Amino acid sequence: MKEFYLTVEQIGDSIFERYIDSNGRERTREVEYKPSLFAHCPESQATKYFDIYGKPCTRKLFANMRDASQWIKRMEDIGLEALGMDDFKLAYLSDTYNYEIKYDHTKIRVANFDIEVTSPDGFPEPSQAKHPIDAITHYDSIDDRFYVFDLLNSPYGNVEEWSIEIAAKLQEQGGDEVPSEIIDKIIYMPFDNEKELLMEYLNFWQQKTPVILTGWNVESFAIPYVYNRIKNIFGESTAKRLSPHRKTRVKVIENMYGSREIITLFGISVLDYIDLYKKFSFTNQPSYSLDYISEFELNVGKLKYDGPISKLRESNHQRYISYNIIAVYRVLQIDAKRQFINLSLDMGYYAKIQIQSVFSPIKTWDAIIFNSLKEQNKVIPQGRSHPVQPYPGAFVKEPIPNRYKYVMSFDLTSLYPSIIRQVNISPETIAGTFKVAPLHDYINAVAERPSDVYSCSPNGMMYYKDRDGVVPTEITKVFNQRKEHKGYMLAAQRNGEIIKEALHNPNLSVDEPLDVDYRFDFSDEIKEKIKKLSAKSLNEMLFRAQRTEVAGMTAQINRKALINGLAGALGNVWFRYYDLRNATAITTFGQMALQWIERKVNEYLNEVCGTEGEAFVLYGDTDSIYVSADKIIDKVGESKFRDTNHWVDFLDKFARERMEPAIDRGFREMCEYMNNKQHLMFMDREAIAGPPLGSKGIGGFWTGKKRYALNVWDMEGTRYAEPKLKIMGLETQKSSTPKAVQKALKECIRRMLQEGEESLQEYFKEFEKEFRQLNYISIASVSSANNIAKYDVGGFPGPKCPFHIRGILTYNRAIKGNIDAPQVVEGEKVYVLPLREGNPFGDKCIAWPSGTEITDLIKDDVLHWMDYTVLLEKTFIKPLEGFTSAAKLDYEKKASLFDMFAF
DNA sequence: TCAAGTAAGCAGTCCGCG
DNA sequence: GCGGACTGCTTAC
Ligand SMILES: O=c1ccn([C@H]2C[C@H](O)[C@@H](COP(=O)(O)NP(=O)(O)OP(=O)(O)O)O2)c(=O)[nH]1
Ligand SMILES: [Ca+2]
Ligand SMILES: [Ca+2]
Ligand SMILES: [Ca+2]
Ligand SMILES: [Ca+2]
């Protein structure tokens, strides 16, 4: 096989690389790498290196990396550009792996660990590490084994050995229900004292040195704690053994706001799964406790135990250890589903960066662009400092707030990247400017053609049309991968609906799930076989189809985040290729494109329907348009339709055969108008929405910009077995809205859109009656909590004190001088509840760490003093009244009148 | 919440608004 | 009480 790096670091004048060699063995080397940088020179100087603008450069080979750094400094002092890759390890990888890397994950040691530390006197601060580590479970991907390190003797209690037998038994039998599938994979090692535990751990570590090191909060907790506890007991040198190169760096951070300390272990690539989850998952969670995330992702009931965690070890060591093992596993389970580790390796190897740099699209794109340019003997520009300037983005149409019965949406394929490609937008394809007219002029096709020669954006920029720029070229590469996985994602989806469909008529028999590949649309043969299956088998397949769809969503959306990250980076002053001319050429092109195709659609529809001036486009945001189809449905009748599927078929057909051609034509014109390099404005039908036929549903509604709801029957070719609600921006979709309330608001929306006013009133009233029965966590608001210290004076609320922050202050007072009480953590999320007047807490609300039960120290009084009425009308009623008025209907009947004597 | 971008909504505070 | 100037937070894209 071809070799690949595992990790790379620059330590002084040496590069340290861990790699897999041509024979599949992990190796390590130290290399005194001599970097090259560049500087402009006179033309006569016949060279083979040119800066991206075609200016000739001379390569300067330095004896070592310090010299090269120093040279950059001097070039600055003199005031000349120092060109080339100044991050030397990236240049190293580029020279060392001058090919498309093919990795083998089975050779890569991915280590997943979790530790426990008993602490009775507060949260065990990693930088303090004053408490013994009494448990460590460390899973190794190569061995596929859970290594358990169990402290038996501590100042906080002496315990007996964990029992794998009891671990396996059902919770209902006194066991801990450690899943049978990993029971065999557990290597258990009890220790008589902590020193012996930690020494063995390091020895173990030296032998199976993590390449990728992950887990849950390992970067802000596990790692710095192990590092500092070993340092406290044995000294730095021993602690530095966590680094294959024995080099570590204390490190921090970024604001804004405050700071935190992490330990940088050289030679290791740390991908804290919480951070991976935050970047790649596209969810916003009320809490990021592993318990909460586990239940969310896997639907596993949270691990339960009596007493505080700080007493768990000594009252129930059995469970303590078992839960440390399950913690490690839950993370493995999330990854098997979401597959963020795979995604990270893919991206890091693609770009040829430290794996952990996938967290940075700027670092990622620098590297992609640099390797691409280096291939042609081109030299990259020096990174320069810029002041931060605001700059305009997308256009958002103001909608008339209303109900909307029949809606079809259309959406441009991957807008910003497509604009980059169509226009040929790149640092080195800038051809000049033209005298701009107001945007509206281009929109209405009255402005003079910007250029007969170059490819233009309405922001005034012109671009070469002879050759593709490196930004278009490279962005095209990731766009195509993205597209491939989206195909797999959508096919797994369509397939899922077929299984769901079958689940209406499950056959009575024992059989197996069909061995198929859910990334591809089912063959008619597989379709027949599914109709003949049992519910148990159909359910299983459905599970696998949905797991395929999730795998595809991970692969596709994050490749989209990457390429969209490029368009955005052009607006970030830290990007080597930062340029507001290019950033705004992209966003201004977008504005034009959307309102241009709005004018076109309206025009098309006023002709076909034989009217004038009608606004068929009711809304639009960035790259999408929403068209009112009432009139298109009416033309046929609305009777004349057997069922709901019948008109969806009709609308589908109309979109595909009449509108998209008209839409393509409109965009082809615009391409010519801007004299663009390549027409890539592809706007496909996205959503088909309306109420069930014969129903009183209102189909859809809008309250304003970025706030709407729709009863979707078909989405991007996926024809749902059950209508799916697409709700955007409304409180159902916000993490700050209480769980119970979201659910309730959603049912309310479902009833409005599917059943109508009367079904709506009925539920709203039923909810209002039963509200007070809801569990307190399910009805608490949620907020991030920033700048507490800022508004703390009393500690009472200082001037301008935010509501949630005030709640925190109320909490802090209630638990004053209570060392065990859970502490609200600056920058994290809290649950918030209002409190009735005259409550013992002395304020109008209280707040506590989200994800948790509020301590037993105050729970009872909080429950007694919760203001249900306030809570209710702020979170449920008010927003609901917002929906109903925009929709022009009533959540309460409502004069009869009628009836006979009740009148 | 270290880690590409802007647009824009709603909650809440403070205070005007005769 | 509703709305602006504003801070904080959170979506859509
Ligand atoms: O996080 C984002 C999301 C979108 N955008 C911009 C770029 C994107 O092209 C445009 C429209 O985003 P969509 O959510 O519609 N996805 P996109 O159009 O990129 O591709 P697709 O619709 O095929 O997913 O909005 C960002 O800048 N950042
Ligand atoms: Ca799009
Ligand atoms: Ca899309
Ligand atoms: Ca059947
Ligand atoms: Ca969109």
Q: Which residue has the tokens 């441009």?
A: A412
Nucleotides of B under 7 A from a protein CB: 1-14
Number of helices followed by number of strands (H, E) in chain A: 28, 31
CATH of the domain at A648: 3.90.1600.10
Decide the pairing of beta strands A269-270 and A153-154.
Answer: unpaired
Separation of A830 CA and C11 C1' (Å): 19
Half-sphere exposure of A855 (CA within 13 A, CB side): 20
- A416: Cβ below 6 Å to ligand 1? yes
**Runs of H (alpha helix) within A774-840:** 788-791, 803-814
Task: Report if residue A715 sits inside a domain.
Answer: yes
Concatenating the DSSP letter of every residue in A306-355 gives SS-HHHHHHHHHHHHHHHHHHHHHHHHHHHHHH-HHHHHHHHHHHHTS-G
CATH of the domain at A64: 3.30.342.10
Helix pair angle (A535-569, A309-338), 10° resolution: 90
Mark which of A307, A339, A371 sits at the end of a domain: A339
Concatenating the DSSP letter of every residue in A462-489 gives EE--SS--HHHHHHHHHHHHHHHHHHHH
Method: X-ray
> A718 and A594, same structural domain?
yes
> A325 and A400, same structural domain?
no
**Ligand number nearest to the C-alpha of A587:** 1
Range of the structural domain that residue A806 is part of: 775-866
In single-letter form, the type of residue at position A379 comes to V
> A151 and A241, same structural domain?
yes
> A610 and A485, same structural domain?
no
Task: Report if residue A598 sits inside a domain.
Answer: yes
Q: How many domains does chain A have?
A: 6
Task: Report if residue A137 sits inside a domain.
Answer: yes
CATH of the domain at A760: 1.20.1280.300
Separation of A415 CA and B12 C1' (Å): 36
Separation of A574 CA and C1 C1' (Å): 47
Decide the pairing of beta strands A4-11 and A56-61.
Answer: unpaired
How crowded is residue A708: how many other Cβ atoms within 10 Å of its Cβ? 24
Q: What are the structure tokens assigned to A757, written together?
A: 């006013």
How crowded is residue A587: how many other Cβ atoms within 10 Å of its Cβ? 24
- A393: Cβ below 6 Å to ligand 1? no
**Ligand number nearest to the C-alpha of A726:** 5
- A411: Cβ below 6 Å to ligand 1? yes
Distance of CA A857 to the CA centre of its chain: 36
> A757 and A717, same structural domain?
no
> A600 and A499, same structural domain?
no
Mark which of A697, A729, A761 sits at the end of a domain: A729
CATH of the domain at A300: 3.30.420.10
In single-letter form, the type of residue at position A643 comes to D
Nearest to A151 by CA among A238, A224, A233, A217: A233
Task: Report if residue A189 sits inside a domain.
Answer: yes
What is the Å distance from ligand 5's center to A782 Cα? 27
Instruction: Classify the phi-psi angles of A254: left when phi > 0, otherwise alpha if psi is within -120 to 50, otherwise beta.
Output: left
Closest residue CA from atom 16 of ligand 1: A414
> A480 and A454, same structural domain?
no
Q: Considering all nucleic acid strands, name the nucleotide whose C1' atom is nearest to the C-alpha of residue A829.
A: B1
Task: Report if residue A447 sits inside a domain.
Answer: yes
Determine whether the distance from the CB of A572 to the nearest atom of strand B is below 7 Å: yes
Write the CA distances from A488 to A475, A516, A546, A550, A874, integer angstroms.
20, 13, 12, 10, 42
CATH of the domain at A862: 3.40.1820.10
> A763 and A647, same structural domain?
no
Nearest to A850 by CA among A118, A333, A293: A293
Nearest to A680 by CA among A694, A693, A670: A670
Q: Considering all nucleic acid strands, name the nucleotide whose C1' atom is nearest to the C-alpha of residue A797.
A: B13
> A173 and A188, same structural domain?
yes
How crowded is residue A745: how many other Cβ atoms within 10 Å of its Cβ? 24
Query: A329, A182 in Cβ contact below 8 A?
Result: yes
User: Which residues are CB-neighbours of A700 under 8 A, at least 6 positions away?
Assistant: A403, A404, A405, A407, A689, A690, A708, A709, A710, A711, A753
> A286 and A144, same structural domain?
yes
Q: Considering all nucleic acid strands, name the nucleotide whose C1' atom is nearest to the C-alpha of residue A396.
A: B7
Closest residue CA from atom 10 of ligand 1: A415
What are the residues facing A702 on neighbouring strands? A402, A708
Write the CA distances from A744 to A560, A737, A749, integer angstroms.
33, 11, 9
Mutate to test the pocket of ligand 1, among A395, A564, A682 (most ligand atoms within 8 A of CB): A564
Separation of A337 CA and B17 C1' (Å): 57
CATH of the domain at A515: 1.10.287.690
Nucleotides of C under 7 A from a protein CB: 7-13
The phi and psi torsions of A189 (rounded to 5 degrees) equal -130, 100
Distance separating alpha carbons of residues A271 and A219, to the nearest angstrom: 8
Distance separating alpha carbons of residues A60 and A861, to the nearest angstrom: 73
Distance separating alpha carbons of residues A232 and A852, to the nearest angstrom: 32
Q: What is the 3-state secondary structure (H, E, C) of A836-870?
A: CCCCCCCCCEEEEECCCCCCCCCHHHHHHHECHHH
Query: A454, A499 in Cβ contact below 8 A?
Result: no
Mark which of A382, A411, A435 sits at the end of a domain: A382
> A311 and A164, same structural domain?
yes
Task: Report if residue A900 sits inside a domain.
Answer: no
Distance separating alpha carbons of residues A640 and A158, to the nearest angstrom: 80
- A414: Cβ below 6 Å to ligand 1? yes
Task: Report if residue A759 sits inside a domain.
Answer: yes
Query: A605, A627 in Cβ contact below 8 A?
Result: yes
Distance separating alpha carbons of residues A362 and A351, to the nearest angstrom: 11
Q: In Å, what resolution does this model reach?
A: 2.3
In single-letter form, the type of residue at position A727 comes to I
> A543 and A447, same structural domain?
no
Nearest atom of ligand 1 to the alpha carbon of A567: 27
In single-letter form, the type of residue at position A395 comes to F
In this complex, the residue with its CA at the shortest distance from the C1' of nucleotide C11 is A729
Q: Considering all nucleic acid strands, name the nucleotide whose C1' atom is nearest to the C-alpha of residue A621.
A: C13
Q: Considering all nucleic acid strands, name the nucleotide whose C1' atom is nearest to the C-alpha of residue A781.
A: B11
Determine whether the distance from the CB of A557 to the nearest atom of strand C is below 7 Å: no
Query: A849, A830 in Cβ contact below 8 A?
Result: yes
Task: Report if residue A544 sits inside a domain.
Answer: yes
Distance separating alpha carbons of residues A848 and A628, to the nearest angstrom: 46
